[PDB]
Amino acid sequence: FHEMREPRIEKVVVHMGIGHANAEDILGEITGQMPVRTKAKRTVGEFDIREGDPIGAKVTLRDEMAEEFLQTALPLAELATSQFDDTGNFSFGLDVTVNLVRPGYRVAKRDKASRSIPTKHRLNPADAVAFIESTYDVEV
RNA sequence: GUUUGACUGGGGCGGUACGCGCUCGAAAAGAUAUCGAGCGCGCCCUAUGGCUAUCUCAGCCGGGGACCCGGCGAAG
Ligand SMILES: [Mg+2]
Ligand SMILES: [Mg+2]
Ligand SMILES: [Mg+2]
Ligand code: NA
Ligand code: NA
Ligand code: NA
Ligand SMILES: [Sr+2]
Ligand SMILES: [Sr+2]
């Protein structure tokens, strides 16, 4: 029961919301894999009337890539209870987002007979702080 | 030598109900008038057409009015 309930890392998304790019090179270094451009929507007074066009970049890491990143990334932040989602997610900072979830998450990400994850199987902030804190760092 | 139209609560002036589309008037099939009420069309587009692949939108909340992550969300 506990084995298929103990949290894990779905993905670690690192992104730099600039607003017009040349910053891909560092992400390609700090994470290890190719980043992708970020386009915006809706015209914007702040000389941002171009809908589709480079404005940011991000890198989504999974498995090892994700953990090998957090090992050297988490120590760079000072996690706090507020910094946590209602789903058991937390992001710090160049933004760094950590998406945590339980084993059979796929049930909501697959194509056939997908289904939404029952709140009971949904990760909790409490369960989140724990799991994480239970590995190289402090809380509040 | 001719023409100078029609409609119209008389005619003139005003207007066009003079060709078209929608809601209501219209009375739960269809049809249905007034110078009836609300209001549009005489285009624009080589993509703003076609198919395929991948995908889900408004709006609100939570975490780092531009961007990133998650949640709610049959359609506003
Ligand atoms: Mg004669
Ligand atoms: Mg007459
Ligand atoms: Mg009828
Ligand atoms: Na781009
Ligand atoms: Na005539
Ligand atoms: Na009159
Ligand atoms: Sr005459
Ligand atoms: Sr009279």
10 Å Cβ neighbour count for A46?
6
Whether any strand B atom is under 7 angstroms from the Cβ of A17: the reply reads: yes
Whether any strand B atom is under 7 angstroms from the Cβ of A87: the reply reads: yes
Domains and CATH numbers, chain A: 1-140 (3.30.1440.10)
Distance, in Å, from the CA atom of A135 to the CA atom of A72, rounded to the nearest integer, reads 13
Technique of determination: X-ray
Distance, in Å, from the CA atom of A65 to the CA atom of A6, rounded to the nearest integer, reads 20
Whether any strand B atom is under 7 angstroms from the Cβ of A89: the reply reads: yes
Separation of A84 CA and B9 C1' (Å): 78
Q: Which helix (H) or strand (E) holds A27?
A: helix A24-30
Query: What is the number of the ligand closest to the CA of A53?
Result: 4
Q: Which nucleotides of B are covered by protein (CB under 7 A)?
A: 55, 58, 62-73
State whether residue A102 is helix, strand or coil.
Answer: coil
Q: Token digits for A55? A: 């404005």
Question: How far is CA A138 from each of CA A44, A69, A90, A134, rounded to the nearest angstrom?
Answer: 40, 18, 14, 8
Candidates A32, A36, A13; CA nearest to A24 is A36
Distance, in Å, from the CA atom of A75 to the CA atom of A43, rounded to the nearest integer, reads 38
